Amino acid sequence: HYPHVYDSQAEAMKTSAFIAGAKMILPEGIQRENNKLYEEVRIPYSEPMPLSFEEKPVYIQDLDEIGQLAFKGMKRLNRIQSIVFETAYNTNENMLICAPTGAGKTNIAMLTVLHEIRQHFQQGVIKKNEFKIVYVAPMKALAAEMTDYFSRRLEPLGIIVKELTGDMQLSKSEILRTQMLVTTPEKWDVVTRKSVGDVALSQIVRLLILDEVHLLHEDRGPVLESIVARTLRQVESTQSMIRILGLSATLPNYLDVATFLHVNPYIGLFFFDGRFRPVPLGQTFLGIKCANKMQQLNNMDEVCYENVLKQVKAGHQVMVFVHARNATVRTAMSLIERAKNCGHIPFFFPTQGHDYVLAEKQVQRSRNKQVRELFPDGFSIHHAGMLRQDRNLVENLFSNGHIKVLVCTATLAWGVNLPAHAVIIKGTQIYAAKRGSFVDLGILDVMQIFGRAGRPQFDKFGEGIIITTHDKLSHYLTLLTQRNPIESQFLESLADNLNAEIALGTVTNVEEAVKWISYTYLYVRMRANPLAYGISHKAYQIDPTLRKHREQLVIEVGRKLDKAQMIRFEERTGYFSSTDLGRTASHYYIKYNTIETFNELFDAHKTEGDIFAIVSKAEEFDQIKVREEEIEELDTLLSNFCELSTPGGVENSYGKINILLQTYISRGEMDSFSLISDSAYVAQNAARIVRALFEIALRKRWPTMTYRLLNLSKVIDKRLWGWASPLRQFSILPPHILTRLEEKKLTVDKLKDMRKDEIGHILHHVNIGLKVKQCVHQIPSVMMEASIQPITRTVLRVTLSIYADFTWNDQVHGTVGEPWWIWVEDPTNDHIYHSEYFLALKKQVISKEAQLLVFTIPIFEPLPSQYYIRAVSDRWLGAEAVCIINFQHLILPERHPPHTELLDLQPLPITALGCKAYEALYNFSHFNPVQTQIFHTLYHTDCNVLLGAPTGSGKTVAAELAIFRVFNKYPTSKAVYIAPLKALVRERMDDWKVRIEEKLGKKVIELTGDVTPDMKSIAKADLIVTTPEKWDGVSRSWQNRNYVQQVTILIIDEIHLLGEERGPVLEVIVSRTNFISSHTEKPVRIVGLSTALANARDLADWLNIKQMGLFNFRPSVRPVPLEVHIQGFPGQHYCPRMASMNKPAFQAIRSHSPAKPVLIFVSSRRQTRLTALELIAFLATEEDPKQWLNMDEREMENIIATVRDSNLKLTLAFGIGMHHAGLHERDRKTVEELFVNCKVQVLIATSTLAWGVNFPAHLVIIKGTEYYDGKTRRYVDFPITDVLQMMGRAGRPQFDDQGKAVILVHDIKKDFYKKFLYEPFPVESSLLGVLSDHLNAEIAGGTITSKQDALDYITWTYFFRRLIMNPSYYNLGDVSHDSVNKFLSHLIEKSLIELELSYCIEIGEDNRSIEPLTYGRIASYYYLKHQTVKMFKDRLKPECSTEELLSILSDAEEYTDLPVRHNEDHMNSELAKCLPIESNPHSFDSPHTKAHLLLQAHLSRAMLPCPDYDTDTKTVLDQALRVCQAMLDVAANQGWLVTVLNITNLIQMVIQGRWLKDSSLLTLPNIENHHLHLFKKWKPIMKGPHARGRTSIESLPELIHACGGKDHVFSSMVESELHAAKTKQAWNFLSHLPVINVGISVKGSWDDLVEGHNELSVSTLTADKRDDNKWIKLHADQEYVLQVSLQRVHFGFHKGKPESCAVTPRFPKSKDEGWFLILGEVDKRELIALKRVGYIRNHHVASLSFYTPEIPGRYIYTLYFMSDCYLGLDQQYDIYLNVTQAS
Amino acid sequence: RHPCDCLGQKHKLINNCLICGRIVCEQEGSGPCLFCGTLVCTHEEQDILQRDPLGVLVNPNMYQSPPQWVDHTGAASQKKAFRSSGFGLEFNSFQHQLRIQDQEFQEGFDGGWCLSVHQPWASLLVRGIKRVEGRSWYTPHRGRLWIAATAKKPSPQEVSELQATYRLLRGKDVEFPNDYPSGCLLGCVDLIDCLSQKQFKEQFPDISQESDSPFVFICKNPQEMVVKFPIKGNPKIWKLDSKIHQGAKKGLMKQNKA
Ligand SMILES: [Zn+2]
Ligand SMILES: [Zn+2]
């Protein structure tokens, strides 16, 4: 149909019809002068036609600005640019190009790249990372050349390119920062099949470049077509646009590949021919004809002499090919002797000039001697054997032209562009080890050879010579300028490609497999010619689409793969799933017969020698035959370089492969070039094979085998034997030095311990000794130790503390870090338990901190002697660490007693309660069995009870019954309920207040974290709901105060949460409550409600119950039965995991309950998006697209219109829902309400909101169980109790019959989950971690006197109860009385030592009596810790400035618990700018630094990127205020007043979120500095009078005085710039802000019988005008009391005392209107007294106390009235004391 | 019978009472339930009717011995080397000044401060008969303070006028502990406020006539024990020694036992 209009050469004719028994379309009638000694065809010639007006060249000016800057501006664009620019720079569809010139390829490549970049985004040319384009190159040479070309070509864009070609696995960060990649088709294929990860690249490629697809004809074409099919399938599966631009040189058939490349015939089929090439690249077709190989050799070397003689007659400079580096030398002297013979030197010597002498001296510099003798004549040698320097010399002397002929053995053609006039291929037979037997060269190689025949615009004729024999010359002629269609061989590698696709998960069933076959070029080739591929034309007639043959091939290959256990294929329904073995085989590009041989040969008891036989017998080495020439070298190598036993001898192929591997290990030297190439081939192969086998054995858990395979892999890639010295891997160490070391039999450890000077003396070189010492110190190593924690009788939980003990070197160890494999090896049982990967980071080694890992291994009833925990480096030979863990007399936990049977015969009606008002809060008319049982044991007998009913049983009803009992029997008492979760506290408070506060006549009030507000809160509370920390702070002091003795209940929900880390306060709270109850003789009941506990007996004994209230129920008790299914999803790096559990989640939904409300949780704050889009994309191909849309779409469209989130589209429009940290937490509550009924039908949770509304559901899949963040740089499992409670939310008594849940976790811990998903999890105390802190309170309050009573106090704690039953968990040795009491004494002594080092305790000379200190008392009052008060005392100094107070605020240890999001390091760093102060740039991951940044942002009014920060802000703010006040007290204890004033200013900023450096009036709500000029202008309130004051109202007290209580006759018009939007806010802010005036009178406090003088009132008005009234006649050394009467003056509009709550626009909590007032001197800078007072409703009096120095001096004190919760309302009053002596 | 508490976890069960919701065992049955006294019977049997030493801080435990302290550990051995410093108490120093006299701090923590009051007034102060104390000096310590009996023996005639003064305020209804000690430390009271007489009249005029002084101590409910502490006596506002303070607190717990 003539696609396009440009293509040429559409013409042919018949000339002779016989060219060596073939037809060759003769262009211009060239003649074949075949003779006896050779056969040849003449040189074809082409003449380009003169292009006149068909197209105009493109320039630089007619481009966008990006086009201007990217273009270098040569202003000359060839005809290729003119032809292609319309579609390659404007259109954005797939296209291909094929040119005989690479200059016409690279320009198109980068112009298309720039076109895609500029069309991607307008800001995309400014900001990168929105796309990831990829380039492919044949092998390393062109990849590196293109990488350098792209690095130097495009500087202005800032785009950075890379070259990853079979070198290493690129890191996630590296590809994140990089924007484009360059690789090879094999490397690209392996990296795409291993591209499975948290983030992949194929979905953000957006552009893929292919070059020279002609390789599809010869070899490696299966890889290219496989990757093309992979990217096309990804494109069609992601519904995105990714451009495909193909590139080649010449294709005999181009329509087939065009259809394969998915490009329409008309747009971009631009086929370039020899006519349209710039130069006439003709070539000869010489041949040979001899019966014997010796005469063949003399004949074709004579022919080579003949045409090079013709060339020297022409005079141009030429270059000849050989096949091998060794053979190029013999060809070199053969040509030299030929040139010397026959006397043709007179036509051969190079010309002589000054440049010739320069080249002569330059080569004389070089070491090489062959080039020295080659220079005088016209010969040059080029090879890869000699270093690059001589390659520069030879390439530059070629460039200048001193030389005539060059031999190059095919490395520069791939590597370096140096064109030559005539190119001689010589028809060399490459001994490619992939084929063997000297296979003929491919078409791609020879075509690239002819590519350099045209030297740019200095020669007008291109020539090329081919020399070979008859059949070879005919074969070569048949595929160089003939129309023979390009044929692909995909069936041979079909099994491997199907295995790779199945492993990737893209192909799952037969139909999509057939579609993938259709995508490949093999299908297209089958369409045209079915006979060549085994399909009859009649079979084509019966099925045009050939779908039946595709299905047959797919099922056959699936059968072959399934018989090898690689994939699990089901035919009767038609799907194949990938297995671990198949994934491993695909990842390393292993042929299926190789893994079949593994399965039929490998075992768990192979030695170190038979592994060589196994790897040699594999079939990728089968194309290697032992030859008569190779046998001599092979037997000599076996004689000399052998190191291990080699079964098979030398009479088989695998034997020779084994020998070659063995001699390659020891860096052996060999002669045969073909054997050298074979050695390299088998080296690379056997390396990948041994890596795959190591992975397979590791997955099979074979320790004694995986250790050997890892050592073998290290040996093969390190080129050093196992017994060789580890120092051999360092190139800096001279080899003779290493020989001297090994001759002394020294090892790494001995010389590491042995001091450097002695090793220098022994080796007789001190410098060498120091160098080897600093080198061995760089050898990787790690010191590690394990602690055993027997959680259960069988399941253990060992903790490994590891730390690097080697000096770090950036080059030696690598920037990324050091890899390690850690496995728990058992010698006897011989199967690994929980192998793991570890990475030692830069700061991990530098800081040498003890990295902690925790993992669980199973044990058996017969205790094993020991488990060899082994850590082996994955890259450094001889770097292993073994930590033998003995199992000596470790006490396992006793088997817990069974639960209590649930007896139910008749439900209990609510009328049995006895009070109509009490039962009016319920709706059901009867009690479920749990409440039926607990109705009388609770609320009727008044004894402490522990209930362990499962979730959803209704323990809330038990709490209601207890509260009803408290309200009924003891109305004068009070009730308090404790819940460990803030969300749980909020929801319980909401429920309590809606149900009981308005209905029942009692009082309900929440408690905040401030002791003195809690005084009034608890005065008339009658019901308290508290998170444990607040209640512990309230009850911290009980001895010296008498408000809490009237409470007689403690309802504690989720008591099992005491076991984990953030719930230890429950233990101390219950212990102190029991202590108070026992030491007050007024018992306080305890009601502990939680889920089922296996060890509930210990908790029962803790609460002092014998048989009264022990209520433990089995999980089969809830009204809604729960069914759980077991499933495993094996994987690694969690990369295949999300794809693994996503696939059957929908299948579970349909099988269990389609279109039913279900809540899911997999998102760790990140997986929300991935899960949402993957789910919405997968569900499209189903019978009911709107299955989860049982309601109309109009309410969803309205809701999505109301929702302002940009990602929630297409999810809440569908049935997909979520409730995450976003949507301002209200609209997601609306979607939760929509989920309450059956509308949404599905939602995904973030696993952090598991505690909350607790909306019901039917089917739950636990898809997300692990989480990783910046806490420990590694993934950690969810708590088992957390998972249990979170999954137990399923079920609903009125909308479902039973609850359904399934498990989606990897296989290695699926057994552990199954063990713990049914058996209740025992709960263990965690009091030790903060054991000191609580003790501080108990020693600050006077409850503790000595060390002995401090020890015996701990008996009341649950930790003491649990220690006896589970000793080995708490590192205790033996249950004997001496051992336990010694351990307790040691632990408590360590805690007391830490407390003393924190400046909190005094031990005294006796050392047996501990006295509290003032700092520890302050820490106890403000709910602090030892480690924070210690730093408080350490870094608090006199005369500090506000930034120092902020710094001391930052490092409070209460901020340690602040979490990280694994990404905060970026936003905290970017928000660190534009701030008044800055923190350490290297501590951005520190939680203290994050809290400091948060405090700065809040206090400076800064925006927070992540919404959760706001929540964190509140928490931080709370803590800050607390410690802020404590800070003041510490300063108040020190003596000086400057820091006290600074801390007062700091708390003012905290409560106001401002600074004292700015204006005070900025504290007004919604007021900023930019409009203060409008506030700057000020006239008198009434118009006309002359100004009296400053005519400015900047001062806030001045504003209050001028505006008064009116705030509407003056402030309303002047503040009209706020357009009355929030002027009422400022109105009430000013109205509630009071002004107070004071009057001070000093009165004596004489002891007795003195009475001194009368009261002396000193004027508050500034008095220094030489008056004795100010000079109080004060008697020295007499205590004197300053009575200050401070009264407010309400202007009368508000009448005074509106409320007692101060306005806090920015602070979350509500705080009272305090007032600070201090008395001190300024000359010495110390204070004498400090006071803080609460609300001053109208007037009050404060009584300060102060002394006087004995010196009768006339000095000055000062009283400062400071604002506790305001700004600028502070006043100063100086008192001049004329103190005199007293008699 | 006897209300056995097994709830079916030790033996079999019978019908639970409807009124009280109380699970009843087979140990006691065939009659009214203990809690509410109504007839309750199982279905199979109601069908017939239808047809017609002791440490200061230690709790009782199933342990053979409490966790005594052993000083054999080397960690305390190191501490014994450099614990030579310390044992510094200011005791009764007029130069003492808290300089942080916030009211809320003092009653949270007992600082060991003690005061000496004359026995005729001290007895009524510690028994709560008298509510306000009068002294010339002013004390910024607003926490718990102990009261030490004076060394001088009170005259029997002072109790007559003291009783007569408080007859209108209290009356003869409240019993008076005529046993008056001397030189002991029976007193332990908490202080809430100190202020001048004029402010006392202004804000607290109801009981201001009880006592008049330049500064008035207002003391809330005190505590009492049955044991006697001998103390020599010290001038006003003196820090109690550690040994007596520890013993006094222990006695306070022992009286809290009763
Ligand atoms: Zn019983
Ligand atoms: Zn009853």
Q: Is A942 left (phi over 0), alpha (psi -120 to 50) or beta?
A: left
Distance CA A583, CA A228 (A): 20
Q: Are A405 and A317 in contact (CB under 8 A)?
A: yes
Judge if A1343 and A1304 occupy the same domain. no
Which three-class secondary structure state does DSSP give residue A319?
strand
Residues A1006 and A1107 in one domain: yes
A1130 and A997 share a domain? no
H-helix or E-strand spanning residue A834? strand A833-840
Cβ-contact B143, B114 below 8 angstroms:
no
Question: Quick one: which H or E segment has residue A1726?
Answer: strand A1726-1733
Calpha distance A1080→B257 (Å, rounded)? 7
Give the C-alpha separation, A512 to A236, whole Å: 12
Q: List CB contacts of A168: < 8 A, sequence separation 6 or more.
A: none
For chain B, the farthest-separated pair of C-alpha atoms sits apart, in whole angstroms, at 93
A1046 close to B (CB below 8 A): no
Residue pair A285/A466 in contact (Cβ under 8 Å)? The answer is: yes
CB A977 within 8 A of CB A963: yes
A1324 Rama class: left (phi>0) / alpha (psi -120 to 50) / beta: beta
Resolution in A: 3.4
Q: How far is the CA of B3 from the centre of ligand 1 (A)?
A: 7
Q: Which of A614, A786, A820, A618 is nearest to A697 (CA)?
A: A614
**Residues, chain B, total?**
258
The secondary structure of B15-42 as a DSSP string is PPPTTT----BTTS-SSB-TTT--B---
> How many angstroms separate the CA atoms of A1454 and A1524, rounded?
13
Query: Locate tokens 């490549």: which residue?
Result: A109
Minimal C-alpha gap between B62 and chain A (Å):
10
The token pair that represents A1519 in the structure block: 């803590």
Which residues are registered as beta bridge partners of A1717? A1731, A1761
- HSE (side-chain half, CA atoms, 13 Å) at B240: 27
Of A193, A172, A174, A202, which Cα lies nearest the Cα of A161? A174
Three state DSSP letters for A592-648: HHHHHHHHHHCCCCCCCCHHHHHHHCCHHHCCCCCCHHHHHHHHHHHHHCCCCCCCC
User: What Å distances lie between residue A1648 and A305, A720, A1746, B213, B236, CA to CA?
Assistant: 135, 97, 18, 12, 11
Nearest to A1778 by CA among A1759, A1755, A1757, A1758: A1755
The answer to whether the beta carbons of residues A89 and A108 sit under 8 Å apart is no
Could you tell me if A893 and A793 are in contact, meaning their C-beta atoms sit under 8 angstroms apart?
yes
Q: If you write DSSP's letter for every residue of A1491-1546 in order, what string do you get?
A: HHHHHHHHHTT---SSHHHHHHHHHHHHHHHHHHHHHHHHHHHHS-SHHHHHHHHH
CB A1468 within 8 A of CB A1437: no
Measured CA to CA, the distance from residue A1575 to residue A1560 in angstroms comes to: 13
Q: Nearest Cα to A244, choosing from A96, A79, A440, A444? A: A96
The letter for the amino acid at A664 is Y
> CA-to-CA distance for A329 and A335, rounded, in angstroms?
10
The encoded tokens of residue A676 equal 């050298």
> Do residue A1040 and residue B107 have CB atoms under 8 angstroms apart?
yes
What's chain A's Rg over C-alpha atoms?
Answer: 44
State in Å: Cα A915 to ligand 2 middle.
Answer: 15
Crossing angle for the helix pair B242-257 and A1065-1080, nearest 10 degrees? 70
CA gap A698, A1217 in Å, rounded: 41
Which value, to the nearest 10 degrees, does the dihedral of the CA atoms of residues A804, A807, A813, A815 take?
90
| Inter-residue contact A1411 to A1336 (CB < 8 Å) | no
Same domain, yes or no: A920 and A972: yes
- DSSP annotation of A462: B
Residues A183 and A268 in one domain: yes
Mark yes or no for CB contact B136/A1647 under 8 Å. Answer: yes
Are the Cβ atoms of B105 and A1681 closer than 8 angstroms?
A: no
Q: Is A902 on the interface with B (CB under 8 A)?
A: no
Helix (H) or strand (E) holding A1123: strand A1122-1125
Please state the separation of Cα A440 from the chain's center in Å. 49
Residue B67: list chain A partners with CB under 8 A: 1351-1352, 1354-1355, 1360, 1380-1381, 1384-1385
Parallel, antiparallel, or unpaired: how do β-strands A1024-1026 and A976-978 relate? Answer: parallel
Cα separation, A920 vs A938, in Å, equals 19
Domain ranges of chain B: 1-52, 103-257
Question: One-letter amino acid identity for A479?
Answer: L
How far is A1349 from A1037, CA to CA, in rounded Å?
18
Confirm if A495 and A553 have CB atoms less than 8 A apart. Answer: no
- Residue A10 has a CB neighbour count (10 Å cut-off) of 8
Indicate yes or no: CB of B56 within 8 angstroms of CB of A1731.
no
| A1669 Cβ contact partners less than 8 Å away, ≥ 6 residues apart | A1658, A1659, A1663
Nearest to A1161 by CA among A1263, A1235, A1093, A1256: A1263
Contact A102, A451 (CB under 8 A): yes
Handedness of CA A1452, A1453, A1456, A1458 (dihedral sign): negative
Contact A1076, A1084 (CB under 8 A): yes
CB-CB: which of A933, A1037, A1360 is closest to B108? A1037
| Nearest CA distance, A1653 vs chain B (angstrom) | 13
Is residue A964 less than 8 Å (CB to CB) from chain B? no
How many Å from the N-terminal Cα to the C-terminal Cα in chain B?
Answer: 33
3-state secondary structure (DSSP) of residue B226: coil
Q: How many CA atoms lie within 13 A of A1613 on its CB side?
A: 7
Nearest by Cα to A1561 from A1643, A1630, A1658: A1630
In 3-state terms chain A splits into helix, strand, coil percentages (rounded to 5) of: 40, 15, 45
Tokens of A909: 């009606």
Rounded to whole angstroms, how far apart are CA atoms A555 and A573?
12
Nearest-CA neighbor of B123 among B253, B246, B4, B222?
A: B222
User: Residues A1322, A1093: contact at Cβ < 8 Å?
Assistant: yes
Q: What method did the depositors use to determine the structure?
A: cryo-EM
**Who's near A691: CB < 8 A, 6+ residues apart?**
A588, A713
Query: Do A227 and A314 belong to one domain?
Result: no
What does the buried/exposed string (b/e) look like for A1165-1187 if buried means 16 or more CB atoms within 10 Å of the residue's CB? bebbebbbebbeeebeeeeeeeb
Tokens found for residue A661:
């591997």
Domain that holds residue A446: 293-478
Chain B contact present for A1360, CB below 8 A? yes
Q: Which helix (H) or strand (E) holds A833?
A: strand A833-840
Q: Which two tokens stand for residue A1544?
A: 């007062």
Closest CA to A170 of A194, A144, A154, A205: A194
Minimal CA–CA distance to A1308: which of A818, A823, A790?
Answer: A823
Please report, as a single letter, which amino acid is at residue B231: I
* CA A1704/CA A1628 separation, integer angstroms: 12
Is residue A1013 located within the same domain as residue A980? yes
Looking at residue A1341, which CATH number applies to its domain? 1.10.10.10
Q: B191: helix, coil or strand?
A: strand
Measured CA to CA, the distance from residue A1493 to residue A939 in angstroms comes to: 50
Query: What's the CA dihedral at A1490, A1494, A1500, A1506 to 10 degrees?
Result: 110
* Per-position DSSP letters for A1654-1705, written without gaps between them: --EEE-SS---SS-TTTSB-PBTT--EEEEEEEEE---SSS-S-S-SB---S
Q: CA A1718, CA A1715: separation in Å to the nearest integer?
A: 10
Contact of A906 with B16, CB cutoff 8 Å: yes
Asked whether the CA dihedral A1177, A1182, A1184, A1190 is positive or negative, the reply is: negative
CB of A888 within 8 A of CB of A906? no
A1348 to B13: CB separation less than 8 angstroms, yes or no: no
C-alpha closest to that of A314 among A417, A413, A460: A460
Q: Which of residues 1519-1548 of A touch B (CB under 8 A)?
A: 1529, 1532-1533, 1535
- State whether B18 and A908 contact (CB < 8 Å): yes
Residue A42, beta-bridge partner list: none
- What is the C-alpha separation between A1552 and A1547, in angstroms, rounded? 8
Tokens encoding A597: 């041989």
B65, B101, B136 member nearest A1731 (Cβ):
B101
Residues of B in contact with A1647 (CB under 8 A): 136-137, 236
Nearest C-alpha in B relative to A1731: B102
Question: Can you tell me the distance from the alpha carbon of A1065 to that of A1071, in angstroms, rounded to the nearest whole number?
Answer: 10
CB contact under 8 A, B236 and A1729: no
Å between B99 CA and nearest CA of chain A: 4
Closest Cα of chain A to B31: distance in Å?
A: 18
Helix A1487-1499 crosses helix A1507-1534 at what angle (to 10 degrees)? 90
What tokens does A386 get?
């000699």
Q: Show the tokens assigned to A502.
A: 């199945």
- Spell out the SS3 assignment of A789-820: CCCCCCECCEEEEEEECCCCCHHHHCCCCEEE
Token code pair at residue A1292: 């609903």
- Chain A residues within an 8 Å CB radius of B79: 1389, 1393, 1403, 1407
Is A105 annotated as ligand-binding? yes
Please tell me whether residues A1177 and A1286 are part of one structural domain.
yes
- Give the single-character DSSP code of A996: I
Whether A1412 and A1427 share a structural domain: no
Q: Which residues, at least 6 apart from A810, have a Cβ–Cβ distance to it below 8 Å?
A: none
Which residues sit opposite B189 in a β-bridge? B145
Q: Domain check: are A1379 and A1452 in the same one?
A: no
A719: closest CA among A678, A679, A674? A679
CB neighbour class for A750 (10 Å; exposed up to 12, middle 13-18, buried from 19): exposed
Q: Encoding tokens for residue A1626? A: 């400022």
What is the rounded CA–CA span in Å between residue A269 and residue A8? 11
The number of beta carbons lying within 10 Å of the beta carbon of residue A976 is 25
Contact A1493, A1467 (CB under 8 A): no
Q: Is residue A910 less than 8 Å (CB to CB) from chain B? A: no
DSSP A552-580: HHHHHHHHHHHTTTSEEEETTTTEEEE-H
Output Rg (C-alpha) for chain B, integer angstroms.
30
Question: Cα separation of A1657 and A1660, whole Å?
Answer: 9
Rounded CA-CA distance A286/A477 in Å is: 11
Half-sphere exposure of residue A1114: CA atoms within 13 angstroms, side-chain side: 11
As a whole number of angstroms, the distance between CA A1144 and CA A505 comes to 13
Question: Is the Cβ–Cβ distance between A366 and A387 less than 8 Å?
Answer: no
Contact present, A161 and A147 (Cβ < 8 Å): yes
Residues A324 and A462 in one domain: yes
Task: Give the one of B76, B109, B196 whose C-beta lies nearest to A1037's C-beta.
Answer: B109
Dist. CA A271–CA A1374, nearest whole Å: 87
Instruction: Look up residue A128 and give its two tokens.
Output: 């990168």
My answer on whether A959 and A1009 are in the same domain is yes
CATH code, A1302: 3.40.50.300
Query: What backbone phi and psi angles, to 5 degrees, belong to A1305?
Result: -140, 165
Three-state SS letters, A86-147: HHHCCCCCCEEEECCCCHHHHHHHHHHHHHHHHHHCCCCCCCCCCCCEEEECCCHHHHHHHH
CATH number of B103-257: 2.30.130.30
Cα-Cα end-to-end distance for chain A: 129
